[PDB]
Write a protein that binds this ligand. Structure first.
Ligand SMILES: NC(=O)c1ccc[n+]([C@@H]2O[C@H](COP(=O)([O-])OP(=O)(O)OC[C@H]3O[C@@H](n4cnc5c(N)ncnc54)[C@H](OP(=O)(O)O)[C@@H]3O)[C@@H](O)[C@H]2O)c1
Length: 316
């Protein structure tokens, strides 16, 4: 298992990174510090997570301690939906850079294909409970992302939560300057993403699997929802390897040539979750885990189902 995957800009992206959604500001600094100590080099961030300042504190400390240098880190962030207007993209990226205390990102993603009404609220809703969209489109937002590469603010650009037709839109764009390097999508045994992964990989786009543990901390979880970490069939695979269920769930996407970004703020779990380069899942294990697909999404953006660019009406 090589620890990095080559992107279309010649850079190498660590296949195991630390997620930071719902890592509270009061805990994320320690989380990132520990992660860096134990070998994480890739950190997945976003302005919408409201903790980039505190991620930045951790990175700054570890740079100053001489634990890592900047070139060894792979820092990812994402353009939030309220900043899809071409005139807002650079300022949104620069806010992220200022909070992270960095002068470039290794990768900057369009967080969702859906643009929302610009304003202070991250999720502007109307009386029907539906999001208020913006008059933005994928191709113009992409052109604004491209300018960030041209200006040296980001080394690579990509997308997140795009369906294959939305990816195709960018790929077919007249005058395209940079292909998306990465599509970051939800992926785990209950949402195995065979078709979208095959599509992206065939196009030279690296896939990053988010919510690989099934995001048990997600805010809209219901008591009846499937729970991957507690699935006894996965516990059984883990026991056979003398590993934890999380370790199996992290190794699974790695063996599909995906990048994976498990989130924790708990130091012991951060360290444990990285110990996935000392075992292999068998063909039977992989097949069994793939067979658990139920097309069950934890991140279905249910307030956005009427947005013109909602990604999940399409099969993939
Ligand atoms: N692009 C997008 O739209 C999008 C959407 C969702 C997620 N993401 C990215 O993907 C990252 C990962 O997804 P996620 O945060 O949704 O969920 P996840 O990584 O599937 O699961 C995170 C949860 O698992 C717990 N956990 C972590 N390690 C564990 C272990 N060894 N044993 C037991 N529980 C463990 C964490 O608890 P503690 O933290 O309390 O230890 C947390 O509650 C996010 O943080 C974010 O960076 C992106």
């Amino acid at each position: 298992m090589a620890s990095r995957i080559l992107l279309n800009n010649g850079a190498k992206m660590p296949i195991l990174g630390l997620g930071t959604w719902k890592s509270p500001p009061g805990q994320v600094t320690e989380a990132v510090k520990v992660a860096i100590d134990v070998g994480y080099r890739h950190i997945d961030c976003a302005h919408v997570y409201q903790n980039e300042n505190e991620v930045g504190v951790a990175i700054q400390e570890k740079l100053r301690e001489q634990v890592v240098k900047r070139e060894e880190l792979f820092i990812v962030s994402k353009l939030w939906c309220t900043y899809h207007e071409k005139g807002l993209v650079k300022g949104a990226c620069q806010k992220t850079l200022s909070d992270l205390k960095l002068d470039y990102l290794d990768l900057y993603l369009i967080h969702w294909p859906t643009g929302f009404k610009p304003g202070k609220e991250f999720f502007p809703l109307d009386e029907s409970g539906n999001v208020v969209p913006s008059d933005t489109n994928i191709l113009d937002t992409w052109a604004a992302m491209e300018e960030l590469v041209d200006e040296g603010l980001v080394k690579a650009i990509g997308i997140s939560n795009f369906n294959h037709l939305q990816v195709e839109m960018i790929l077919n764009k007249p005058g395209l300057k940079y292909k998306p390097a990465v599509n970051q999508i939800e992926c785990h045994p209950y949402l195995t993403q065979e078709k979208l992964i095959q599509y992206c990989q065939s196009k030279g786009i690296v896939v990053t699997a988010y919510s690989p543990l099934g995001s048990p901390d997600r805010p809209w979880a219901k008591p009846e929802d499937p729970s991957l970490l507690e699935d006894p069939r996965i516990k059984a695979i883990a026991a056979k390897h003398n590993k934890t269920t999380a370790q199996v769930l992290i190794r699974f996407p790695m063996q599909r040539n995906l990048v994976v970004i498990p989130k924790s703020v708990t130091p012991e779990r951060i360290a444990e979750n990285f110990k996935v380069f000392d075992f292999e899942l068998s063909s039977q294990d992989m097949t069994t885990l793939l067979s658990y697909n139920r097309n069950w999404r934890v991140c279905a953006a249910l307030s956005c189902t009427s947005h013109k660019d909602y990604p999940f009406h399409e099969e993939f």
